[PDB]
């Protein structure tokens, strides 16, 4: 895994799968205490943002993905 | 305010300040308790949450701490 995602994994998040997200972000689906989490890697491969991505229509894309799984 | 940020705003987040974030993201500091929102370079997507660096430091916490 990319460094920030690997570092997050070492802090108790299990990484489940990767996905391509919009805005040039690479997505990682993980779990923290049996709850789904989405982590987004910046283009440089060096930073990652754990949280919820919203689009131009106000859709919470992360919820969509986590709920689907 | 970008469209995706307006949509987080609707959930009871007030936007206070912008900042330059690593990884080429545009940062927005808001309040609910401090929150950080990161806009993608295309300006059409935004992520409410916490940014971590290469060694797993939570960068958002530090920023929110300083306000």
UniProtKB/Swiss-Prot annotation, chain B:
Principal cellular location given in the protein's record: periplasm
Alphabetically ordered keywords of this record: Chaperone, Disulfide bond, Periplasm, Redox-active center, Signal
Subcellular location: Periplasm
A single cellular component GO annotation: outer membrane-bounded periplasmic space
GO biological process: chaperone-mediated protein folding
Keyword Signal included in the entry's annotation: yes
Disrupted gene: phenotype observed: No visible phenotype.
Protein name: Thiol:disulfide interchange protein DsbG
Organism listed in the record: Escherichia coli (strain K12)
Taxonomic classification: Bacteria, Pseudomonadati, Pseudomonadota, Gammaproteobacteria, Enterobacterales
Complete-protein stretch covered: 20 to 88 of 248
């Amino acid at each position: 895994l990319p460094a920030p995602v690997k570092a997050i994994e070492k802090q108790g998040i299990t990484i489940i799968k990767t996905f391509d997200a919009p805005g040039g972000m690479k997505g990682y689906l993980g779990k923290y205490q049996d709850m789904g989490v989405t982590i987004y890697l910046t283009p440089d491969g060096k930073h990652a943002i754990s949280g919820y991505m919203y689009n131009e229509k106000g859709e919470n894309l992360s919820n969509t993905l986590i709920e689907k799984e």
